[PDB]
Amino acid sequence: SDMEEKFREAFILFSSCSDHIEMYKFFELMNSFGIILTNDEKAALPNDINMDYWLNFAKKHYNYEQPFKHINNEQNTNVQIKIDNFLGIMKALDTRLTESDLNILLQITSTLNLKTVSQKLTESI
Amino acid sequence: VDESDVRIYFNEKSSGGKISIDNASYNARKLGLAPSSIDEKKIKELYGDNLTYEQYLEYLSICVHDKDNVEELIKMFAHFDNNCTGYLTKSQMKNILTTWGDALTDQEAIDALNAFSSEDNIDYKLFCEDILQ
């Protein structure tokens, strides 16, 4: 019902139901909630990541009071970016997506703000 | 299909004439029918939990599922076969059965895998063959 039952669901997806997820896919998994660690913290992580460690890491590092804090930047929050200019930042930086990019904007809806995106992503999760 | 056992299992698990859905499903599985949560809820919004033989026959038909085969079920198991070997890890196949659809607990699915084959790499093709039987 809570986050505990939702975290387990998210592991079986990124691991593709694997017991031991690959380091790179584990980072996709943490980010999907609103978890980003410091350069040092990201080295403190174990060699082989498993479900048991993932769920401990989930409790500690996930934001509960405001699930997506990392999206808020208040110079970037209040400001309105056009749909085309927003995709410009996205297409150059992108490390994941291909055509699921059009589907992210649909999850939000011309001029958008970060507090709108975070609010909609809180309902997505 | 066995017509004789249909009536026998009804009166055996009947109570005050009417039969409870839990028992109707139990009898469906006793014959060789596979009721899911979708088939179970369809009858709930009609005459209640307890329903007579008149209504029990209508539930026997919703449990038939004639259009069931090897590729009508693997739509979730092939979805997780990124390795392209056909063989799927016991544990991989396990967690699939626990999290989504019908609530099959760890022990329910765990023992079902080992009962089919002892090996870790289990083909979800040969798996459909016997559970559908």
Q: Which of A9, A17, A19 sits opposite B80 (nearest CB)?
A: A17
Q: Which of B91, B92, B99 sits opposite A9 (nearest CB)?
A: B99
From CA B62, how far away is CA B54, in angstroms rounded? 14
From CA B113, how far away is CA B91, in angstroms rounded? 9
Q: How far is CA A12 from CA A64, B3, B36, in A?
A: 22, 43, 23
Say which DSSP state A81 is in. Answer: E
From CA A95, how far away is CA B15, in angstroms rounded? 62
Q: How far is CA A76 from CA A66, A70, A72, in A?
A: 17, 12, 7
B-chain residue closest to A18, CA distance: B92
B131: Cβ contacts below 8 Å, ≥ 6 apart: B112, B116
Q: How many angstroms separate the CA of residue A63 from the nearest CA in chain B?
A: 24
What was the structure determination method? X-ray
Q: Which of A8, A9, A18 sits opposite B92 (nearest CB)?
A: A18
**A contacts of B82 (beta carbons < 8 Å):** 16
Buried/exposed code over B84-107 (b: 16+ C-beta within 10 A; e: otherwise): eeeebbbebbbbbbbbeeeebeee
Furthest C-alpha separation in chain A: 44
| CA angle in degrees (0–180, nearest 5) for B91-B94-B95 | 95
SS (H, E, C) B57-90: HHHHHHCCCCCCCCCCCCCCCCCCCCCCCCEEEH
Q: How far is CA B84 from CA A20, A93, A110, in A?
A: 19, 31, 42
Q: How far is CA B45 from CA B51, B72, B96, in A?
A: 12, 27, 29
Q: Name the strand (E) or helix (H) holding B51.
A: strand B50-51
**A contacts of B77 (beta carbons < 8 Å):** none
**A contacts of B93 (beta carbons < 8 Å):** 17
Mapped onto helix, strand or coil, the DSSP state of residue A50 is strand
Cα B117 → chain centroid: 19
**A contacts of B96 (beta carbons < 8 Å):** 12, 17
Contact with chain B for residue A99, Cβ under 8 A = no
Buried/exposed code over B29-49 (b: 16+ C-beta within 10 A; e: otherwise): ebeebebeeebbeebeeebee
Q: How many angstroms separate the CA of residue B95 from the nearest CA in chain A?
A: 7
Say which DSSP state A108 is in. Answer: T
Q: Which of B80, B91, B96 sits opposite A19 (nearest CB)?
A: B91
Asked if residue B120 lies in contact with residue B90, where contact means CB atoms within 8 angstroms, the answer is yes
